[PDB]
Amino acid sequence: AHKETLDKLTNAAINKINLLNTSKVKYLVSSAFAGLYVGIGILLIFTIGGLLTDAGSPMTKIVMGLSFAIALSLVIMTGTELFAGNNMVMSAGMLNKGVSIKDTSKIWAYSWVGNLIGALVLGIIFVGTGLVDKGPVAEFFANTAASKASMPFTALFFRGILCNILVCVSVLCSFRTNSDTAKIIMIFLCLFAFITSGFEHSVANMTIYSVSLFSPTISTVTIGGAIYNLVAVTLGNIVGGALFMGLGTYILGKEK
Amino acid sequence: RAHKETLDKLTNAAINKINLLNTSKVKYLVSSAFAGLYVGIGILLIFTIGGLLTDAGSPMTKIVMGLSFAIALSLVIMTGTELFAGNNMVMSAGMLNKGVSIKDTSKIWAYSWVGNLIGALVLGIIFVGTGLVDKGPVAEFFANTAASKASMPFTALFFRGILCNILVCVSVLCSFRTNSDTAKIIMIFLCLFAFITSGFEHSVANMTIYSVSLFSPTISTVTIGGAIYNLVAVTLGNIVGGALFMGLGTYILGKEK
Amino acid sequence: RAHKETLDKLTNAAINKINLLNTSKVKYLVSSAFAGLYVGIGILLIFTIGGLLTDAGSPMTKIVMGLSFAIALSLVIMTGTELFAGNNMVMSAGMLNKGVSIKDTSKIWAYSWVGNLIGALVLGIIFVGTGLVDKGPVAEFFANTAASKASMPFTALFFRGILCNILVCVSVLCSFRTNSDTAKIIMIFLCLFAFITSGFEHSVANMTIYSVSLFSPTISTVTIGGAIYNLVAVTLGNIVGGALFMGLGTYILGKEK
Amino acid sequence: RAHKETLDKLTNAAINKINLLNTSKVKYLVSSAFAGLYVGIGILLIFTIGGLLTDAGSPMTKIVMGLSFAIALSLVIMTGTELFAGNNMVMSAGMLNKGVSIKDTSKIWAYSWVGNLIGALVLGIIFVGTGLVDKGPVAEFFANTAASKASMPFTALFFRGILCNILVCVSVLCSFRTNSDTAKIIMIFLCLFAFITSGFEHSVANMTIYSVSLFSPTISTVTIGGAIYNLVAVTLGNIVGGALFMGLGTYILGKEK
Amino acid sequence: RAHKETLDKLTNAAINKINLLNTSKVKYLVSSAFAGLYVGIGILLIFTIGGLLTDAGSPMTKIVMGLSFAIALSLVIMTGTELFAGNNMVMSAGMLNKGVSIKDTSKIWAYSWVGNLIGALVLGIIFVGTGLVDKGPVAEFFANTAASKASMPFTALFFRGILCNILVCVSVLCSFRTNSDTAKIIMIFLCLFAFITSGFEHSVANMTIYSVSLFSPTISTVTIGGAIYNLVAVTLGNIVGGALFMGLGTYILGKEKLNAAAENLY
Ligand SMILES: CCCCCCCCO[C@@H]1O[C@H](CO)[C@@H](O)[C@H](O)[C@H]1O
Ligand SMILES: CCCCCCCCO[C@@H]1O[C@H](CO)[C@@H](O)[C@H](O)[C@H]1O
């Protein structure tokens, strides 16, 4: 089914750019939504992170895994626009010559900034709830924000590669099935696997950092680091969805 | 992406709704009353689970609660009954697309919300009549939880309503975007898991929290004053979630212009 | 929204039943006793779980129990056999809709009910002969639970029976409003989780509880008379719940007036 | 209800089974061989969990074993292979509705049972070629379990075998009454969960418990004798559930008279 | 029923493998590099869970691992890429029904096994580049386990390998026997749960166990003295399991003896 699958991606990447050109507003709103949806997955699993860490549980990371599925299922079911997702779609619509290389940069920049707006809004709204005034949920937000930015560039970059491989292969699957339940199941597996192994997702991290920098619970982060993390993780995401995933699928599916 | 397809579904749903309310009150109110009591049933369950695990000081309590809430919207979706929270996105998207009046939207909203409250009252009543809240760790969960919800700063509540109806309305958005009933239940299952466990606030459900709390004699931690104070703030937040985010957001994605 | 196409089905099934009964008392009763026995299986499984987990002092006891009862209405639905409680609403409507009579409806409720009971008795006899209720925490869980059911005030039982059959019948309502069998089961499993774990009462599962409790000679807490007290209060609650509520409501939603 | 259609379905499945033994003994035995081994896989996994959770004092042992047994009957349905248990309902229903003869049924039963036994033997052998039962609590679990089943009183095993094949068969009955492969797998998971955990007896499953426990050089307290004793009692038990309840029951429900 | 209607599918499908391999030695190898990596993704995940619960000393350890391995074959099937252990059945059953040939089998078998190999390796370096195996119970879990699997008698690894593949292949068999994708994944999860938790030996997944072990800083307790050895036993095993049993067995069930234009069963 590889050729049809290429034609599905190719065709998908043409609709992205087609969309951006007609309405920046629709395009950025679609992306804001996706950034939010992913964030909501963070709200949930950090809440859980906070709960079980306080407890002493060896199960904390496993359950955060299980619980993350809502992040990409929401994106997939809503047909909203996600950065990492597009790393592969465009990276292979481009090799198929459905879209220009610079069609592919406009999409990446807009979807990523669009996602970031979804994050900041979510974070702002999440802080108004007081759910991170203080407490273990708010210390989890704060401690995770810190470790992620205080980790070397190479470590982050490679975790970024394995994250999008997985996020992207999850999107890939949505093109290769017509069951919506298989889509959701596969998203849940790939998200379980990436969160639990310890891989880094740029757009998720926008909500981690967006929340941490809006909560007057004094952390130890600083923008330099968040931006540092987001640069490090984002390229890897690109490498993981564009290179591996994006290129491999063009390869498998192209009538040469 | 079917954004416009989607918006047209939302637009027909707002229409049929106001036709239904206009065409025949008592049906609209029975539809709503069922919704209101289906939601409440997920309170009965998750608070039984609340009282059970909290007595044990289990760290899983809220997680398991979040997990056990799916029934509330699953039932509403699969019976095709009228919930207030979902009406915030449907009517709002529908008003912008000129399918419905603003006061169509107004009526629908006030009705479901009141209809729901009626199903929550009955439920609260009948549930007290079971003696399951006569005393012990479960009564205590209803009393501590109705108290803390009603003593919370308006701002915190308001914002908690927004994040909730974003979750509820999008789980309902999903149901418009798929023809798999299992997919609907799964998505709903995920949304309610996120919003219960994350700590977001849902007016129609709080109805049953205060219904149970005000009808029960062994529950005297809250008053008929907080309940209203909670429903007002939480509901308002809910409306913002549904109309201002989902409702206007879906209208933006789908509108030919 | 399709509450008319749904009141058609409820009427159509309320009809296809009494036609079955008028045409074969034996075919009807074989189906009844099957569902009584299908329901009883979940009682066996969950009381096993009951006995294992109580004996250990898990706070999870009632929860794992709820989670594990889905088989009861699952077998019923998937084998399209006759179950009392599911009929409180299916006869409720059909008649109110003028498709079957007050006559064809007391008929269904004694047959389905007694047939069901036959299934319970036969499961009891066999399960006892497994020796699985000879000595220990499973036979203890049957003893302990059977008494508490029989020493509880009529009123509490009544109300716990209303809620049980709103959930039970709404799971049946769901099986009618969808074509996905997987979704039917998810929905059954949700409603079964919420009624068992909440503490609501089910007439037909209880037939098995007392069936097992009595036929077992290592169990001496019960007597018939107390099992009768329980069954009459619970059967009446079920009826109200499925009949006044789901019966009356769904006719009201689907009736073109 | 589509009982008539369900009973024609079984009748034609019973026809296809015998026409297939007759056509080719080897293909039938191979199919039966596969089912005994697909069932064995289950036992290997749930006995691994058996050993693990047991050596660890956990009250969830038997609950997890039941939850974990689904693969056994799932692989059988999904592979379309020939399982003794199932043939009890199908052959009988099929002979009752005058589609196959008593000799057809006895030959199917005898053949599929020996076919099943062969699969059990190979698996057991190959499993001992793992060293996973050389020593440690997984071996010890095949050891004490194999012995308690061989030493149980005949009546108890007999009745345990009835309840077991009612569950196995009603779960084959469901795969006949749905077109959804996911819903077949859920109903199988539910039924196996119920039969494993409540303590019911399954012949073909025991073949592997004895296939493993014998060939395993790490020893115990077993004897072919005891294994044979278990098998006989449990087979009779299974046959009664399968043919006398399920075969006969479904026959009475779908027969056009 | 429907075993011949099945057998045509493994048949019509053994072909298509050889075909596209004949047509694109690179289109085919990337398609195998992937599979091996999808499988390795299963290992990083469940191995992270081993470290976690093995360092906590939990009894649930091997159970939860088995319940978590599903992602491995689920991605192969859903992506429709090339995996060695699966090929065994399909290629085997392929000859028997006379659609594809012995040398093809062992070639696809040879180019399946090798596509899978890379993926473990690439994935191997990358995961170690995460520094997620520099220090700790996961780094550890990965080493020990890499030890035993090769510090284990040949006879264990062989039979632990045929069983793996009965299970791995029977899941592939089910994905041939349903048009339900959700049904596919579920049966893949049942089989992978059973096979991981019982403790059966999977070739491709060990390609990645061993990559991460060599490739690591904090080492070893290994030497390729293990690998090759371990892999060589399990594979052989894997083949038999899929080839001997599943391949020939499905042929037998499938073969309409109006051929018969050759041999007679009963
Ligand atoms: C309020 C937020 C609006 C952000 C809009 C950003 C749109 C990005 O626009 C892109 O910028 C790239 C450089 O970054 C260029 O290479 C592309 O040509 C251009 O399309
Ligand atoms: C516990 C979760 C199990 C989910 C099982 C989902 C089974 C769906 O199964 C699939 O549904 C599709 C509709 O979406 C149909 O088009 C397919 O024919 C069917 O195979």
Provide the shortest C-alpha distance from residue E233 to chain A (in Å).
29
CB of A112 within 8 A of CB of A83? yes
Contact E1 D16 (CB under 8 A): yes
Distance CA D28, CA D74 (A): 19
User: Is the CB of C179 inside a 6 Å radius of any atom of ligand 2?
Assistant: no
Q: Which pair of structure tokens corresponds to residue B60?
A: 């899983």
Tell me the three state secondary structure of residue D204: helix
B180 lines ligand 2 (CB under 6 A): yes
Mutation for B interface: A180, A186, A191, most B CBs within 10 A: A180
CA–CA separation, A102 and B161 (whole Å): 42
Q: Which of D26, D41, D80 sits opposite E252 (nearest CB)?
A: D26
Domain spans in chain B, listed from the N-terminal domain onward: 1-257
CB contact under 8 A, C163 and B27: no
Beta-carbon separation of C200 and B130 below 8 A:
yes
User: Counting beta carbons within 10 angstroms of the beta carbon of residue C217, is it exposed (0 to 12), middle (13 to 18) or buried (19 or more)?
Assistant: exposed
CATH of range A1-256; options 1.10.760.10, 3.40.50.80, 1.20.1080.10, 1.20.1090.10: 1.20.1080.10
Alpha carbon distance, N-terminus to C-terminus of chain D = 16
How far, in Å, CA of C215 to CA of C143, rounded? 12
Out of C41, C55, C129, name the one closest to residue D159 (CB): C129
Q: From residue A28, how far is each of A25, A39, A102, B167, B171 by CA, in Å?
A: 5, 16, 18, 20, 22
Q: Could you tell me if the CB of B178 is within 6 A of ligand 2?
A: no
Q: Is the CB of A184 under 6 A from ligand 1?
A: no
Distance from the Cα of E226 to chain A's closest Cα (Å) equals 25
**Can you tell me the distance from the alpha carbon of A183 to that of A173, in angstroms, rounded to the nearest whole number?**
7
Is A227's C-beta closer than 6 angstroms to any atom of ligand 1? no
Orientation angle between helical segments D25-54 and E181-198, nearest 10 degrees: 60
Mutate to test the interface with A, among E58, E71, E130, E216 (most CBs of A within 10 A): E130
Looking up tokens 């020990």 gives: E144
**Cα E56–Cα E62–Cα E63 angle in degrees, nearest 5:** 110
Nearest to B207 by CA among B62, B106, B72: B72
Three-class DSSP category at E179: coil
Yes or no, beta carbons of A251 and E30 under 8 Å apart: yes
The CA distances from residue D97 to C99, D8, D102, D248, in Å, are 34, 8, 12, 10
Chain E: which residues have CB within 8 Å of chain D? 1-3, 59, 62-63, 66, 153, 155-156, 158-160, 162-163, 166-167, 170, 173-174, 177-178, 180, 182-183, 186-187, 190-191, 193-194, 197-200, 249, 252-253, 257, 265-266
- Torsion on CA atoms E12, E18, E20, E22, rounded to nearest 10: -140
CB E164 within 8 A of CB E195: yes
CA distances, D179 to each of C75, E5, E176, E211 (Å)? 16, 18, 16, 44
Q: Is there a contact between C7 and C254 (Cβ–Cβ < 8 Å)?
A: yes
Specify the experimental method: X-ray
Cβ of B198 and A44 within 8 Å? yes
- E252/D27 touch (CB, cutoff 8 Å), yes or no: yes
CB burial of D82-119 (b: ≥16 within 10 Å; e: otherwise) equals bbbbbbbbbbbbbbbbebbeeebbebbbebbbebbbbb
Name which of C159, C165, C169, C192 to mutate to probe chain B: the one with the most chain B Cβ atoms within 10 A of its Cβ: C159
The finding on whether E182 has its CB within 6 A of some atom of ligand 2 is: yes
Positions of chain breaks in chain C, given as the residue before each break (C to N > 2.5 Å): none
What does the block give as tokens for A88? 């592969």
Of A154, A192, A256, the CB nearest to E129: A154
Is the separation of the CB atoms in B172 and B89 below 8 Å? yes
| List of chain E residues whose C-beta atoms are within 8 Å of the C-beta of residue A232 | none
Of all protein residues, whose CA lies closest to atom 8 belonging to ligand 2?
A: E182
Ligand 1 center to A106 CA (angstroms): 6
- Return the ligand 1 atom nearest residue A106 CA: 20
Contact E150, E222 (CB under 8 A): yes
CB contact under 8 A, C126 and D162: yes
Query: What string of DSSP letters covers E39-54?
Result: HHHHHHHHHHHHHHHH
- Measured from the CA of A102, which atom of ligand 1 is nearest? 18
| Residue closest to C242 by CA, chosen among C190, C210, C204 | C204
Contact A218, E100 (CB under 8 A): no
Q: Which of D3, D160, D190 sits opposite C70 (nearest CB)?
A: D190
The string over B182-217, giving b where at least 16 C-beta atoms fall within 10 Å of a residue's C-beta and e elsewhere, is: bbbbbbbbbbbbbbbbbbbbbbbbbbbbbbbbbbbe
Q: Please check whether residue B111 is in contact with residue B28, taking contact to mean a CB–CB distance below 8 angstroms.
A: yes
Which residue, among D51, D33, D32, D69, has the nearest Cα to D213 in the 3D structure? Answer: D51
Rg (alpha carbons) of chain C, rounded to whole number: 18
Q: Compute CA distances D141 → B253, D46, D134, D165, whole Å.
A: 60, 10, 12, 24
CATH number belonging to domain E1-266: 1.20.1080.10
Which residue type sits at D107? K
Give the chain D residue whose CA is nearest to the CA of C53: D59
Under 8 Å CB-to-CB from C156, ≥6 apart: which residues? B129, B130, B131
- CA nearest neighbour of A210 among A29, A36, A26: A36
Distance CA E71, CA A162 (A): 14
Across the interface, whether the CB atoms of E252 and D126 are under 8 A apart is answered: no
DSSP, collapsed to helix, strand or coil, labels residue E76 as helix
The CA distance from E185 to E73, in Å, is 8
Chain D residues touching C64 at Cβ < 8 A: 63
**What residues contact D5, with CB distance under 8 A and at least 6 apart?**
D254
Give residue for tokens 């529950």. B219
Q: DSSP assignment, residue E259?
A: -
CATH number of D1-257: 1.20.1080.10
Contacts of A62 in chain E (CB under 8 A): 49, 52, 64
Q: Is the CB of E180 under 6 A from ligand 2?
A: yes
Rounded distance, CA E32 to CA E82, Å?
5
Is residue D195 within 8 A of residue D171, CB to CB? The reply is no
Burial of E102 (0-12, 13-18, 19+ CB in 10 A): exposed
Mutate to test the interface with C, among D5, D63, D162 (most CBs of C within 10 A): D63
3-state class percentages of chain E: helix first, strand second, coil last, to nearest 5: 75, 0, 25
Token pair listed for D39:
């069932």
Q: Distance between CA atoms of B243 and B37, rounded to whole angstroms? A: 23
The residue among A162, A155, A156 whose CA lies nearest residue A239 is A162
Q: Do E252 and D45 touch (CB under 8 A)?
A: no
Residue A239 tokens read as 């490498």
Q: If we measure between CA atoms, which residue out of B186, B164, B173, B161 comes closest to residue B246?
A: B173
The answer to whether A180 is a known ligand-binding residue is no
CA A20–ligand 1 middle distance (angstroms)? 11
CA of A30 to the centre of ligand 1 (A): 16
Burial E71-99 (b: 16+ CB within 10 A, else e): bbbbbbbbbbbbbbbbbbbbbbbbbbbeb
Residues D11 and D97: beta-carbon distance below 8 Å: yes
Q: Tokens 């020893």 appear where? A: D219
Ligand nearest to the CA of E189: 2
Top mutation candidate among A20, A106, A116, A206 for ligand 1, by most atoms within 8 Å of CB: A106
Whether residue A45 contacts residue B198, with contact meaning beta carbons closer than 8 Å, is answered with: no
Take residue E110 and report the two structure tokens written for it: 């040879």
Contacts of E62 in chain D (CB under 8 A): 48, 52
Residue C45 Cα to ligand 1 midpoint, Å, equals 61
Sequence-distant (≥ 6) Cβ neighbours of residue E233 within 8 angstroms: E154, E157, E158, E161, E201
CB A106 less than 6 A from any atom of ligand 1: yes
What whole-number distance in Å separates Cα of residue B11 and Cα of residue B97? 7
